[PDB]
Design a protein around this motif. Sequence first.
Motif: not given
Ligand code: SF4
Length: 593
Positions: A15-17, A20, A23-25, A48, A65-67, A69-70
């Motif tokens: 994750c890297n807020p 994205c 916090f795209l979340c 997050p 999530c652009p990667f 990580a969820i």
């Molecule tokens: S979990 Fe994914 S989208 Fe949410 S903060 Fe991290 S990198 Fe961004």
Amino acid sequence: MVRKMRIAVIDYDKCNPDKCGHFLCERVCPVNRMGGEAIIIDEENYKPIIQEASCTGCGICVHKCPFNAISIVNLPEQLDEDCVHRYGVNAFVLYRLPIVKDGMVVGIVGPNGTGKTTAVKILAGQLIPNLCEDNDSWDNVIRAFRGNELQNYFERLKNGEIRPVVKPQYVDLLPKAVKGKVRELLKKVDEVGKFEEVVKELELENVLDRELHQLSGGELQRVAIAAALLRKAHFYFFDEPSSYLDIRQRLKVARVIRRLANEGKAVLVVEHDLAVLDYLSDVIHVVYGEPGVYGIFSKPKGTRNGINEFLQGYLKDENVRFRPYEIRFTKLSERVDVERETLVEYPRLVKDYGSFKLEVEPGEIRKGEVIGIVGPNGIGKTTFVKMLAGVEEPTEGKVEWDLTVAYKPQYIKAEYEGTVYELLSKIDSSKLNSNFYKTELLKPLGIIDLYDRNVEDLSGGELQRVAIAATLLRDADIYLLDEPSAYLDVEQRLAVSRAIRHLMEKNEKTALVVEHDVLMIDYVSDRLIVFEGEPGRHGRALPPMGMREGMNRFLASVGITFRRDPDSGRPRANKEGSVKDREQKARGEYYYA
Ligand code: SF4
Ligand SMILES: Nc1ncnc2c1ncn2[C@@H]1O[C@H](COP(=O)(O)OP(=O)(O)O)[C@@H](O)[C@H]1O
Ligand SMILES: Nc1ncnc2c1ncn2[C@@H]1O[C@H](COP(=O)(O)OP(=O)(O)O)[C@@H](O)[C@H]1O
Ligand code: SF4
Ligand SMILES: [Mg+2]
């Protein structure tokens, strides 16, 4: 009926807020969209957090999530009452535990990242399960297991009555923890007085006077197995003893280990080599779930049944399907009678390094077949391959062919500044879009979840998968894969076997595969090439022969027999000194079908 819990794990290391957006979340999150707290921001540690108490499990955040990580999974409430350990908020969690039995070998199988090793440290006392709560005592554990046959094990475990011996997974750390030669360590750790038996069966005579850091993986591994058998205990837990061992070595150690059950000791083993597992195990557990997220131990099963249901990807009692597709071996009577043509031919070859000589018997390679190469390491398998690849000039003989070759090297040291998708797309962008290649290669090996990563930033197991996928995305006349199973968990070996077989089969091409994993060899092979001799001195590769004539020639050099599971069609191993093991050997029949 119904019942269901949501479980969220976020691999923060991904994750890297700031990349994205913000916090795209919480932004994309529907629940937060309507004034809710499904996803909360830890504005301090800058991460997050998903409050599973909300999260509808709609999975929007996951797709966004652009990667990647969820992970959000919907599980049935019931396991909540069999929860054994969780590493924290949105961290990995394990359910249920394997059973240890006096006088037997209980095997454990499943993909990595599903708590195999977690279960081991717990039953060994190294880790006190937190019951997916904040528990820090054994008493609370004993209480939780009231009624289970483990309740007593744990009472004893806390009293200090029993204390398991453990052959650790990561053997590559041993060197940087101890000092001295091999003779010394094995003396100290010795407690049953068998410095000779052990050191001999594990063929350690040479290494003895060398030092920890001057050892290889295979050697290091073996020194670990050794120190474990020298310990005088009752409980022995071996975590992945197969690693770094060749075809011969790994099969010989199972026999050595299994005998502990004889002495009436309780044995536990984690394995990724199904043939090695079968031979070893009396009982078996399957661990299912998503890697890095959660893991569930199945009820104990009979080695036979348990291993077959495993291949099917469906555990009957538990009633679960952990793999969309099954993996079935073709019986024999299902095989196709086919007279293949010769693709190319190779004359007697000879490579002499001065200190080591290899001789290659003349042989024919047929179009559309798959030959598996087997033999102890230090025998000339790779040398051989490099001559067919042309990356190695022969001392005598000559391989002048007009063919294109796809070569997946044994020791690959990734040195390419780019991403996986970059590398593959540059080979054949169309195939990457093929519903066939995504279904048989790309998705099964998990190269999609790797597209974004840099080749140089890949791990041994990943790099293996990308190389294999790279090799197989090329159009050649012949494909050469030198030891694919290295660094791959049980599930990955299977996906690669089905892949290699399917892709070769579909585009009608020929391939040669070096392997130490018996089931992969049996699965992908049409014919076989066996090596013999003195490892490190001389080796002689026999000519291509039928599977039966081949496995017969190699297996007699190890002393292990194989039957045929009437249902699965997989090679079924015979335990040392069984009625069948005896009959089969008496007739010199080590392999059936
Ligand atoms: S979990 Fe994914 S989208 Fe949410 S903060 Fe991290 S990198 Fe961004
Ligand atoms: N100390 C730890 N802290 C946090 N997560 C951990 C820890 N140890 C293991 N894990 C995670 O737990 C999962 C399963 O762990 P492990 O028991 O090592 O799996 P397996 O033996 O099946 O490879 C992995 O996703 C791993 O990253
Ligand atoms: N260039 C070399 N010079 C001397 N010995 C070599 C050389 N390359 C390989 N060897 C030795 O040849 C033996 C067999 O090599 P290899 O074909 O790589 O074995 P394997 O069956 O494990 O693939 C090993 O003992 C190795 O040390
Ligand atoms: S799964 Fe859905 S509901 Fe739960 S956190 Fe993600 S977006 Fe919000
Ligand atoms: Mg919190």
